[PDB]
């Protein structure tokens, strides 16, 4: 059930109106080592989107220009590490870091997992008069003019979410991957598949004869999505689980062993809860054969709830991110090695 | 006043006596380049001392041998522990666990054990001496070994001043002992202070004696203050330097970790970090040097902060905390380091 997750995401993007104030100029340098696609990804990231709400940003790649912040990956400006990879920050080289790790380094570190950036993208994609997911009226993501292509590009997804189709009436499980360098994921696919065919839409263990173009639509045509990170890391939860929720399919998840902190464990199969893959496949078989249990899981809120409110772990929100950067900007300390 | 610091350190070293000499084996891999001298030094470090209280330690320097832990900061897939004397944060991609100076919490993966604690271990050992002016509680751990008798002979001036046989006011102004020249802020501050009041240099940097002092602690005891600067700034980076000051019965003029007040009672030393510039700090040093009362108030303060009268090490650093950290490491089978 993606709608409640979207609802919470939208709330988490709520910030105070500053009418009398005007977004001051903020100059951000990105390291030269950064290639063009990496610069375009950063400009399109939720982090950039959030900061553009409070600052008039100029992004550039000139080391001779004095900047407010400099973003990199492994000068006397404040350096900020930000990556999508399963890589812990080097604090000798970077003054501040944004990542997935479950670590507390006071003002020097902020946890903002890639799933939050994937939610940003889903939210914008749903500002469409034909989308099956609703954005609260007049909220930030409802501000831009909507598109009208959603239903056309995701027919089966709209249909199942729109209750015009039966969720039980679908294929077994999808697997979309093109990075082959992930043994555990490759081996769980082989395992599961030898018990029930699993459909492959990416370069890896491909079964279609081509590589799916719309992962979203493709996942909506199956009851489950084999949802493995490329490696294990505590707190390392990427876009993958978000793609499963959004596509209205049960995620069979592996990657971050602490993923239950981030998402409602009743809403997905957590392979980390089992002692071996066999026991996990035993639970996956059960769900596929017990319609109630299957539907119960598919209708759970993807988020955990506390004090009557669904919540993102450690209250990840636009305000948390903005406060983290306001503290960086106001502090003159340079922590990196010189 | 080193005595109360030594008293807290000794209590922090209190743990239960191992039941009947059946200490399980612990194999630790260390630097392959280490010679017998670095090995000797390691076998005498506080971490080794603490672990030897609960394990029978074997050190490994052969790369083709299995170990329970792989230490240091030079065995890709072993249980790796980062530990360095440098002002360097851990690479948690490469190391499963780390011990350092950073004020960071990474749950079971990180423990803060500043070098100052290891320096205290060495001072404690050196005062298990029948001629020392500092006392180790009876029958406690550092008093269990046989005591030496050379302390006073090597630290006459130090013993005199601590033994109340010398006047602390009747001493030179300030000592500076450094041989690592690559320390801008430090070298410059000496120049700043020396230009107002001569500072005696005992190391290779800004040396004024004509030779390098052999016993740092005896030398520092002959001056009212000790210019005690770290080589670089780092939050939590407090090394053996400030301990050497306390031990020498002289007031540390400190700069290094901006948060040093968490570790030590700020009424016991001059925290250069508390001033917007160096002039202001030397103006405060100038004042202490010329107001006997304020000077003696500072020299007599407990080096440690206290809570409800009880002195404490910041975050309760202790042999128990360190042993618990290692017991968790040893019993946890999760591999955290990048697994190729
Ligand atoms: N539409 C589509 N998406 C894909 C394909 N292959 C992988 N993806 C998705 O793109 C993202 C990157 O997956 P991948 O390339 O395997 O690198 P990974 O992040 O290391 O697993 C994941 O969310 C995949 O599900 C494909 O062939 N088509
Ligand atoms: N006895 C003695 N101690 C020294 C001498 N030079 C430095 N030290 C001490 O050795 C330690 C390291 O000093 P140093 O070589 O400058 O490396 P640093 O850690 O960067 O300051 C400090 O505690 C110094 O005070 C010296 O010439 N004689």
């Amino acid at each position: 059930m993606f709608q409640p997750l979207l609802d919470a995401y939208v709330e988490s993007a709520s910030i105070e109106k500053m009418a009398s104030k005007s977004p001051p100029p903020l100059k951000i340098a990105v390291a030269n080592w950064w290639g063009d696609e990496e610069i375009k990804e950063f400009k399109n990231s939720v982090l950039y989107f959030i900061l553009s709400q409070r600052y008039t940003i100029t992004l550039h790649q000139n080391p001779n220009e004095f900047s407010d912040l400099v973003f990199g990956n492994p000068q006397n400006a404040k350096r900020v590490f930000y990556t999508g990879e399963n890589e812990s920050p080097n604090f000798n080289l970077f003054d501040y870091a944004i990542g997935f790790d479950e670590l507390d380094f006071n003002d020097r570190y902020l946890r903002m997992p890639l799933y939050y950036d994937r939610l940003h993208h889903k939210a914008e994609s749903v500002n469409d008069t034909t989308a099956p997911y609703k954005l609260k009226d007049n909220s930030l993501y409802a501000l831009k003019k909507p598109s009208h292509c959603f239903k056309e590009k995701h027919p089966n997804l709209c249909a199942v979410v729109n209750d015009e189709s039966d969720p039980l009436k679908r294929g077994f499980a999808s697997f979309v991957a093109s990075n082959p360098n992930a043994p555990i994921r490759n081996a769980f696919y082989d395992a599961l598949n030898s018990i029930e065919p699993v459909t492959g839409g990416g370069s890896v263990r491909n079964t279609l004869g081509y590589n799916v173009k719309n992962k979203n639509e493709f996942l909506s045509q199956y009851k489950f999505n084999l949802c493995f990170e490329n490696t294990q890391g505590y707190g390392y939860v990427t876009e993958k689980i978000i793609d499963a929720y959004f596509s209205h399919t049960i995620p069979i998840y592996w990657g971050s062993p602490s993923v239950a902190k981030d998402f409602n464990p009743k809403s997905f199969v957590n392979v980390h809860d089992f002692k071996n893959f066999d026991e996990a496949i035993d639970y996956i078989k059960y769900l596929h054969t017990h319609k109630n249990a299957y539907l119960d899981m598919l209708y759970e809120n993807p988020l955990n709830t506390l004090d009557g409110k669904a919540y993102f772990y450690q209250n990840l929100s636009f305000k948390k991110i903005l406060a983290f950067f306001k503290t960086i900007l106001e502090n003159d300390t340079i922590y990196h090695d010189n």
Side-chain angles (χ1 to χ4, degrees), chain A:
Chain A
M1 206 62 88
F2 181 75
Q3 189 61 61
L5 172 52
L6 183 65
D7 289 342
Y9 179 64
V10 167
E11 285 306 297
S12 77
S14 175
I15 67 183
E16 345 62 46
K17 294 300 179 39
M18 247 62 263
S20 288
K21 294 227 164 282
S22 210
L26 181 68
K27 180 168 314 188
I28 297 175
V30 313
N32 316 263
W33 341 318
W34 282 23
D36 304 350
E37 288 294 286
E38 289 57 46
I39 283 155
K40 173 201 253 168
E41 271 176 35
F42 175 67
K43 229 168 303 200
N44 242 267
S45 74
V46 67
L47 176 44
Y48 188 98
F49 180 74
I50 292 163
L51 292 181
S52 78
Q53 299 310 311
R54 284 275 181 272
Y55 299 102
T56 293
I57 300 168
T58 288
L59 190 63
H60 72 276
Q61 208 175 192
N62 196 329
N64 302 121
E65 197 166 340
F66 279 3
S67 312
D68 298 307
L69 304 162
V70 187
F71 280 74
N73 292 190
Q75 327 168 86
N76 209 229
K78 289 165 199 174
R79 304 173 184 169
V80 189
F81 173 70
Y82 182 42
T83 202
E85 332 244 42
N86 187 358
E87 177 178 344
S88 309
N90 174 151
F91 290 105
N92 301 296
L93 292 186
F94 294 91
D95 302 284
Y96 297 97
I98 291 153
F100 300 86
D101 279 302
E102 297 187 64
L103 153 187
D104 177 359
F105 200 177
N106 290 302
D107 296 315
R108 294 184 68 192
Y109 178 73
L110 165 69
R111 174 159 188 264
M112 187 190 81
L114 250 183
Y115 68 76
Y116 199 69
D117 176 76
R118 188 59 160 156
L119 286 162
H120 171 237
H121 293 294
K122 294 313 189 186
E124 295 201 322
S125 84
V126 146
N127 186 39
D128 186 302
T129 55
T130 60
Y133 294 124
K134 168 163 287 97
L135 299 170
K136 302 60 168 292
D137 299 316
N138 313 319
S139 60
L140 190 40
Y141 291 86
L143 283 200
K144 308 188 184 188
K145 290 309 196 56
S147 47
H148 313 273
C149 61
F150 199 98
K151 196 137 192 160
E152 211 161 58
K153 316 180 86 305
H154 312 76
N156 234 299
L157 177 38
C158 294
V160 62
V161 180
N162 280 157
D163 308 277
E164 306 168 15
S165 196
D166 176 22
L168 290 170
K169 288 190 210 171
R170 291 181 284 183
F172 176 50
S174 53
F175 169 62
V176 182
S178 288
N179 170 2
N181 303 350
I184 296 185
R185 176 161 89 181
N186 289 169
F188 187 87
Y189 167 87
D190 294 338
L192 185 55
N193 181 215
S194 70
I195 279 211
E196 244 305 11
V198 188
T199 313
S203 283
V204 182
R205 295 290 194 283
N206 180 314
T207 271
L208 298 175
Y210 60 85
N211 299 317
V212 188
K213 43 295 146 301
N214 199 341
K215 181 185 184 192
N216 283 352
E217 172 73 321
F218 174 61
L219 294 179
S220 63
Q221 300 153 192
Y222 303 84
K223 302 182 62 188
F224 296 89
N225 168 59
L226 194 31
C227 191
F228 278 40
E229 303 295 0
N230 53 42
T231 54
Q232 172 181 293
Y234 280 72
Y236 179 52
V237 179
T238 65
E239 81 280 351
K240 298 164 188 47
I241 202 173
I242 296 306
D243 284 336
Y245 288 126
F246 189 84
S247 283
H248 205 72
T249 191
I250 296 191
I252 293 175
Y253 186 90
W254 182 96
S256 172
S258 55
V259 58
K261 294 179 177 170
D262 287 297
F263 295 94
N264 182 185
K266 295 182 176 175
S267 70
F268 72 100
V269 172
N270 185 348
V271 172
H272 289 291
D273 299 351
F274 304 97
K275 86 180 188 188
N276 55 52
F277 287 356
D278 192 55
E279 296 196 358
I281 282 160
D282 268 13
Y283 180 65
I284 293 177
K285 275 202 286 183
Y286 170 84
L287 293 179
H288 192 216
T289 70
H290 295 238
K291 71 172 175 169
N292 282 351
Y294 168 94
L295 300 155
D296 282 342
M297 175 168 291
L298 177 80
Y299 298 139
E300 282 282 329
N301 188 152
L303 299 172
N304 289 103
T305 65
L306 180 78
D307 299 319
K309 187 170 293 220
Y311 68 90
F312 284 104
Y313 184 51
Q314 304 178 130
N315 302 315
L316 181 50
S317 70
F318 279 28
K319 286 177 189 181
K320 193 182 184 175
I321 292 160
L322 286 168
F324 182 72
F325 276 88
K326 180 158 185 298
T327 296
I328 293 168
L329 292 174
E330 296 180 358
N331 198 306
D332 299 294
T333 314
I334 289 305
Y335 302 95
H336 70 251
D337 291 343
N338 269 308

